Amino acid sequence: GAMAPSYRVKRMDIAKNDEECVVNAANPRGLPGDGVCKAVYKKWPESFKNSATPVGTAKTVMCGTYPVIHAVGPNFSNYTESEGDRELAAAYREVAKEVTRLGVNSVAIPLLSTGVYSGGKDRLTQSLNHLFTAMDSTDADVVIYCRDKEWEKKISEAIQMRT
Ligand SMILES: [Cl-]
Ligand SMILES: [Cl-]
Ligand SMILES: [Cl-]
């Protein structure tokens, strides 16, 4: 574990992370996709061998010895708000299990279901709170990656609020 487990946020490409493993915002079919998923495919394409997994689950595939945790958040275009919320919470609980199993001291993680899977809604707070619920009991350093300057500020404030 980390000596003093922390949360941090960076505004940059998760494919350039400085952590011991990465969470992919995957699709259920293990396709290259777009956004975070396409950047992950370009950086770690070997990790997409048998990466297909259902909504609400996480499946780890090694690229060399570097773990890529494929986490499948719901597409809120397809799910009801209620069912989507349940699957989004579940995807993050499965990430916590994988991070624990791997024994890493740090993990790079995007906010699941906040991009093309958001169903055109702002889900920063919803997605981040489910990330916290899952990861709070783990002792890995968590580094959240985002692309928007306003999101960086909001995520940083939410981290600092808990102290
Ligand atoms: Cl960048
Ligand atoms: Cl997304
Ligand atoms: Cl963002």
UniProtKB/Swiss-Prot annotation:
Post-translational modification: Phosphorylated by host on serines and threonines.
Subcellular location: Host cytoplasmic vesicle membrane
Residues noted as binding ADP-D-ribose in the record, renumbered to the chain: D13, N27, G35, G115, V116, Y117
Domain Macro: residue ranges: 4-163
Topology relative to the membrane: Peripheral membrane protein
Recorded superkingdom: Viruses
Described purpose of this protein according to its UniProt entry: Seems to be essential for minus-strand RNAs and subgenomic 26S mRNAs synthesis. Displays mono-ADP-ribosylhydrolase activity. ADP-ribosylation is a post-translational modification that controls various processes of the host cell and the virus probably needs to revert it for optimal viral replication. Binds proteins of G3BP family and sequesters them into the viral RNA replication complexes thereby inhibiting the formation of host stress granules on viral mRNAs.
Subunit composition and interactions: Interacts with mRNA-capping enzyme nsP1. Interacts (via C-terminus) with host G3BP1; this interaction inhibits the formation of host stress granules on viral mRNAs and the nsp3-G3BP1 complexes bind viral RNAs and probably orchestrate the assembly of viral replication complexes. Interacts (via C-terminus) with host G3BP2; this interaction inhibits the formation of host stress granules on viral mRNAs and the nsp3-G3BP2 complexes bind viral RNAs and probably orchestrate the assembly of viral replication complexes. Interacts (via C-terminus) with host NAP1L1.
Domain characteristics, as noted in the entry: In the N-terminus, the macro domain displays a mono-ADP-ribosylhydrolase activity. The central part called, the alphavirus unique domain (AUD) has a zinc-binding function. The C-terminus region, also called hypervariable domain (HVD), is mainly disordered and binds several host proteins. This intrinsically disordered domain contains 2 SH3 domain-binding sites and 2 FGDF motifs necessary and sufficient for the formation of nsP3/G3BP complexes.
The protein's name: Non-structural protein 3
Organism: Chikungunya virus (strain S27-African prototype)
Taxonomic lineage from the root: Viruses, Riboviria, Orthornavirae, Kitrinoviricota, Alsuviricetes
Residues of the full protein shown: 1334 to 1493 of 2474
